[PDB]
Amino acid sequence: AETDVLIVGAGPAGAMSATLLASLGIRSLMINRWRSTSPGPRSHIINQRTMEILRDIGLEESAKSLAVPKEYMGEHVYATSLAGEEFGRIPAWASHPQAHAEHELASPSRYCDLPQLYFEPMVVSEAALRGADVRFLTEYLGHVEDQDGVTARLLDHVSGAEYEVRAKYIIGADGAHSLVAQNAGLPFEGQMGIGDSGSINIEFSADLSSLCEHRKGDMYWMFGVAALRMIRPWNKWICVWGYPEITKEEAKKIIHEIIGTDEIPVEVGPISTWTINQQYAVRNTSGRVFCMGDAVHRHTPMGGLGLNTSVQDAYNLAWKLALVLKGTAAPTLLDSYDAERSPVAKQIVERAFKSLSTFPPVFEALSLPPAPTESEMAEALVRLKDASEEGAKRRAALRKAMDATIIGLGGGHGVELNQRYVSRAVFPDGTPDPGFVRDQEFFYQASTRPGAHLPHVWLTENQRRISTLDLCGKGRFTLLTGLSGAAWKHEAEQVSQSLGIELKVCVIGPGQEFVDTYGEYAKISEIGESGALLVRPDMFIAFRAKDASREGLEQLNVAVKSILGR
Amino acid sequence: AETDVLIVGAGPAGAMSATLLASLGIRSLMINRWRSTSPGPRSHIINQRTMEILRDIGLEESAKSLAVPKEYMGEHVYATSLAGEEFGRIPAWASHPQAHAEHELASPSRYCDLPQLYFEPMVVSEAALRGADVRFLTEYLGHVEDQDGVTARLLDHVSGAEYEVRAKYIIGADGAHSLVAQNAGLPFEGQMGIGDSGSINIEFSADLSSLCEHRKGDMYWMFVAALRMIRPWNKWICVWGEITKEEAKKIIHEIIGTDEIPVEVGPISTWTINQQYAVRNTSGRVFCMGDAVHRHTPMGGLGLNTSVQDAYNLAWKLALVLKGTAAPTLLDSYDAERSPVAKQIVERAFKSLSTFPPVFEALSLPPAPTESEMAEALVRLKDASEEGAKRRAALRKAMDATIIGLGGGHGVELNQRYVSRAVFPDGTPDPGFVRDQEFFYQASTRPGAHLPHVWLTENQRRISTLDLCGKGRFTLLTGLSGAAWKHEAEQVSQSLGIELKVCVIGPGQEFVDTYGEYAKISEIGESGALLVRPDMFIAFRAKDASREGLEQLNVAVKSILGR
Amino acid sequence: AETDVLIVGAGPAGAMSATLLASLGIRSLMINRWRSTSPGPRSHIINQRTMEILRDIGLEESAKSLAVPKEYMGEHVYATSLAGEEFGRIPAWASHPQAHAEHELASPSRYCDLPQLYFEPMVVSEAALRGADVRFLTEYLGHVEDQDGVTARLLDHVSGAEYEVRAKYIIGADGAHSLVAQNAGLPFEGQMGIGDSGSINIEFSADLSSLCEHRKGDMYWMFGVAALRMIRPWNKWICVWGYPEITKEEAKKIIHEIIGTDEIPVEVGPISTWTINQQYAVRNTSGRVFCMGDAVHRHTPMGGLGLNTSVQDAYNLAWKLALVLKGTAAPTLLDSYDAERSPVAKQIVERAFKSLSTFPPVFEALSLPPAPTESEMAEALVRLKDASEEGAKRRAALRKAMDATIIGLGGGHGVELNQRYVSRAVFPDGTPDPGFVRDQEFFYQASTRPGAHLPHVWLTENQRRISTLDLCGKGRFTLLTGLSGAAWKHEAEQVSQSLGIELKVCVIGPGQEFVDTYGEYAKISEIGESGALLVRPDMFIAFRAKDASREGLEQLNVAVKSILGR
Ligand SMILES: Cc1cc2nc3c(=O)[nH]c(=O)nc-3n(C[C@H](O)[C@@H](O)[C@H](O)COP(=O)(O)OP(=O)(O)OC[C@H]3O[C@@H](n4cnc5c(N)ncnc54)[C@H](O)[C@@H]3O)c2cc1C
Ligand SMILES: Cc1cc2nc3c(=O)[nH]c(=O)nc-3n(C[C@H](O)[C@@H](O)[C@H](O)COP(=O)(O)OP(=O)(O)OC[C@H]3O[C@@H](n4cnc5c(N)ncnc54)[C@H](O)[C@@H]3O)c2cc1C
Ligand SMILES: Cc1cc2nc3c(=O)[nH]c(=O)nc-3n(C[C@H](O)[C@@H](O)[C@H](O)COP(=O)(O)OP(=O)(O)OC[C@H]3O[C@@H](n4cnc5c(N)ncnc54)[C@H](O)[C@@H]3O)c2cc1C
């Protein structure tokens, strides 16, 4: 064989890497040990960043067609059982109108719900169509790096044959027990994630629309706490509880109990179990090897950051491998992938873990031990309807405990969006880091300073709304300015012809192709009309100039050469 | 010939009074000079207060049918012509996502567009169906007050007969030239406007969906004439601040910018406003409301809305006094509570006008261009120069500032603050508005404020705090630890002969603080209570269920009723 | 390697075969020469039979999510150009209310529009998930049959390796130049399909919603006639015209002309060409080899019968291979696949061709030659607005010509649905063949006589509508009767235990699981309440008894043994 990039793993990080590279005309071979895309729904939250990526490569409309929408997700119920009495609800996934506004303001895209079961084949099939080579039932074994590329060994689970593939780079997208990460010798940290613990799932099928229609939610959590998650509303489900476990048809009895009733016909599907050693890689890159996805960040599902961060890892790297492979960028461009993605890997493992500690106080508020007998809980239900002042303090205590769980259920908007990149890939503009005015995990803060994601606002094109994001992306640098910065067009042209690099310039303003109709661009840009922002193929601002002066203009070339390592 | 209340006027203010009175079992006679309801679309913005009133009387679901919802109203375009180039847009009627959150947090109800052409008949039929006698083609001529009621003289425009009506009260809802306001001798304070001039409106049909559907707005202003939607997107009205031929379709063709679409000119009418508010709305047995007491500009569309709210304030009061449950002094809070609103909404409506000249100044246009000055300005606006960018920034600033009259005045719409004998103070100081009080609603539970909206649940279904309340009766809201309120309410209800529904909100209860938003908005302890008037306003707040706290309910209610 | 069934080809016939077999627990290996599912939209009509199959294996809801619906398809415009003047319209795809009723009455499912581009990966991904082995970049070469199975040779386009796979059967789903059909020596007929002719496609992207919104159609045909087909409304398209052809950016000029205007921005995508030798196989089976799809019927797109007939070939065979592979059926069960599917192969090639002849009379009515100059056509437009009686006869002539094209554009409901099976697989009940009361190509006729598809009507289950079809299918024979035929339950039980075969019985009636609420079952069944219908895994009736008499009961066993070849 022979390819430019061997992509080991076909899950979200791998499927997305192959699609982006193929879109960029890079030859890739993605492999996967198993028969299919993944049997389980697993990962189901899709945050705005991953829906932006889908938008940029034209797959958002598909994603949206197969995905429950945000209006079905909001009602997070805490209760005894599905048919029993609620303790309370919380506005999950930004359903609170203030949350929703903060959400809608931050991006053109929105939260949906799309199980991995569906997400994966949609991306794998697209990578193949875009020209990536894809090959399942192929079980990576190892590799040997030399100065000019790599030579890993493959075991073919159909033929029984074994073979070699010569590449230039290897992406290790191979999941939570990355053999690619072991062989590249990646150091891992923060392993003290509370005694290694798993969870046990249990798919089933029942029409509980009579218990869900009037209160539409992504999830329904019973107090040992067990979650009822909607695969498809409202006939498909899955029960979770915190735990190699075995269960029979006796799981049907657990479900009925969870439903609080035994009179909807149930149909028990597959039963899996999950385990996690919570860790992150301190570095994600070794020589020609680059790991991503679960391969470098392993954690709890709290916040559903994994799949989303996994795809964003792929979006960071792809255009960089493509530029280097084409000789338009030095290989040192590739150093920033660790510089930018590794701090995201630690932050999300740490955040996902920290959310687990928001749940014991729910039990403490009701004066219930870690594990409560049925008489114990039934008594806590009684204490809670007590007409005394102590019953008040108690109802207030539970409300406060419940509210605090939201950080893990749609409240971490800051965590999802607040990426801040420091690297060679990002040319600093001399301004100091401004801060987050509000808590940076809870609330997103838009920034146009180099290192931040391009902020969303609406422009219009033909009197139709277009996002600032839809101007950019597509495996090509974009320069945004206004009428008074007309010189940018020429400066960009010189820089692009000389550096052999595509750089689209958009002069936003009246009578232009794109118009700052609502004035929201002037508002969000942080700089004069004549200033420019340079936006990387991955939506991040890498260069910012305040005006169109000669010294501002002269600096574009220095920044692009610097970004490219030339 | 004999009724308890004679309502003069069948516009929004009159029809609403009749409907509420009738709903309350009070005999009324509502009259109207003309043949029909108003044939003009006129006022169309329905704010949340009016939609709340509609919901309370079960008419919310109806209006909404015949309503254009908020999603169609947002895109306010400023342009040269409809098919020409936009200068820019502003997010009108709370369409900016932050405005929208503030809007939706403030109420169960939402902005809609429902022309008065449709609103009126919807309410006049309900007034008639609910028990009210209604009788158009009948002109109020004058009346004479005496000690026991009033005698009007009516002029039947079908018979030529003239007769008398005896009534215990008279509502003057007879519009911008109230004769009822003149004869009652109500004082008016000016004095805004130079001098007292009107506008011209032009109805017309035309299929304009191809210029409106990708940019859904309530309104499209051209540089100043407004092109306002009646029905999306085929029915219309062209306004601008006489005599006009039917062949003024020209002016329309040019305002919409093309002439390729068939246009069918309907009626052409003129509106003249003399900006004034009554200092007092009440004289003896005469109570004025609507345009009769506040005459003003359409900036902000506060006028139909504040006109209905006048009716919602007065009705349950007339009914309680007519029933003898309440003393006649209870009526005194009508002027104390509604007159300050009447001066506030004229002044506000007028002040918005002055946000428009700065648009022309940004354009460096003369107050009124001529010809190629309006073409030249556009060129300056596209100027690559640094002064051109100052011009664009200046144009943007001027535009943004017009929002105060186009959905921005949420505070104005909602921040009612009543001080009177019908509001029983709880001893706390007036909290301030943390933010600007014209732009931003501030929720309050302090007596004199409207009951705050938040969502509880009933049968795991969302219900608003507002739905528990009103319905022509006083409501007391408390929590589980406030169990005693309900005995106390029962004792107060028998001793005074007045309905007081008590709702104990909590787990296991009929209504549940499912999201905990009530504990959060309440402001008091779970065992505190809030008393809400039939008109959704809080008149008594207790901080807990202590014996001192319990004891005060009966003093408050007696005090609210004048007894 | 080693599998029970080697499936050569991964298009609709192959992807559907692998999904059904995997659903039935049969080990399959499906291969495909190329990188991906097919780049082109191609096949886009989905008729009711293929939407029934999708329903039965639980993929209809997916199919429906990614598919334009019938309400967008109806307006078939004939015109000069898209922005020019229409000649007239016809109610395509059963949009006429009478057509629509006949349509809705015939099935629980409906016409949609779903390009192959999307349909294929949705089925391939499902086959893999259901446990079929799938392997692209694998290029069948040949095989050698012996008495116990087959041994074909494979060429691996990733490794360069070659290898053998031992199977029991081979399905030849390998398209219009079936190497599997050549090697099995299948005779082909009806090749005189008018001098071999092709067509030339031309994908593009433009927002012509302003010309389409008000008249929603699947297609817009210009008069050389060139068709504007909607890939996605209304931004995606493709231009066709009847023709190895080459075109440049000069195709953009053809498009603009077809649009009649050059002011919507266009974006020219890929340009392919199609060619067809119209033929059908006289037999589809040779020893252990079974061909299906284009492999046995090659034809024009008129009526869009290919993809739909292709999938139905797979649905006929799968459950038969599974029963034989499990030893519950003799191998002679497999003889009926040719007996039932081959007459469908000839009928559809012949029908698809015959539709082409409905188009010249449109040109003849307007007195235009085969190929008309621009002055010629412009003159025909003039003649057509002539205020004379000869202008009348002429407008009437064109209306009649246009109406007659509908047989190829949604009018052939009889062709789509009127399958009549005669074979060992179908146990005859002694009644004569009743006939079609109306034209059997135009109008569907429901039949419960053995050999016909189970008729659709609505029952209810929990007061919810359920189709008679939803009772049946699932790789298991089903027996439908009513309360007075209670004996069927026991007779079925004896027959099933002794024959080692699953046979679900449904006793439809009041107070039962399924209820003849509307009485439409009594109406459609053609037999007493106590009669039974036996329905094959593929929805076809194989046995019909008129009542529950002892002789009726005694015959079930004879029929099932006979169907199974035992
Ligand atoms: C059982 C389970 C349940 C989960 N539930 C949730 C949940 O409820 N919520 C949530 O937020 N997250 C959940 N997750 C986490 C989740 O599925 C992801 O984080 C995501 O799938 C990981 O992305 P990758 O693309 O980074 O991982 P992967 O999807 O695991 O991709 C790894 C790929 O590499 C392949 N591979 C591995 N080794 C080799 C090899 N040696 N050679 C060739 N191929 C190889 C694998 O087969 C696979 O194709 C769950 C994970 C699992 C396993
Ligand atoms: C032509 C016109 C256009 C308008 N356009 C707008 C607009 O675009 N936007 C906006 O916000 N507001 C607009 N308004 C303001 C508006 O219609 C209201 O503020 C509202 O109608 C006033 O309510 P009332 O119910 O208070 O007034 P009215 O609707 O005028 O009700 C008065 C009633 O009393 C009756 N009446 C009067 N005299 C007698 C009598 N002597 N005897 C018996 N009955 C009598 C009248 O016939 C009428 O039925 C417009 C008003 C007019 C006249
Ligand atoms: C370019 C084109 C345009 C078309 N347009 C239309 C249209 O507009 N309307 C319409 O109704 N129909 C159209 N069709 C017809 C259509 O696409 C089908 O009838 C259908 O795809 C055929 O089903 P199969 O599943 O029977 O065929 P195929 O989709 O062709 O499946 C054949 C499969 O076998 C593979 N294969 C072939 N040989 C080998 C081998 N030696 N080894 C391994 N694998 C092999 C192929 O790669 C492919 O995966 C078009 C066809 C083509 C080719």
Automatic annotation (TrEMBL), chains A, C:
The keyword Nucleotide-binding applies. FAD binds at A10, A13, N32, R33, R42, Q116, Y140, D294. It comes from the Bacteria. Residues 2-352 form the FAD-binding domain. The keyword Flavoprotein applies. Keywords: FAD, Flavoprotein, Monooxygenase, Nucleotide-binding, Oxidoreductase. Gene3D superfamilies: 3.40.30.120, FAD/NAD(P)-binding domain. InterPro entries: FAD-bd, FAD/NAD-bd_sf, RIFMO-like. GO terms for molecular function: FAD binding; oxidoreductase activity, acting on paired donors, with incorporation or reduction of molecular oxygen, NAD(P)H as one donor, and incorporation of one atom of oxygen. This is 2-hydroxybiphenyl-3-monooxygenase. It comes from Pseudomonas nitroreducens. The gene is hbpA.
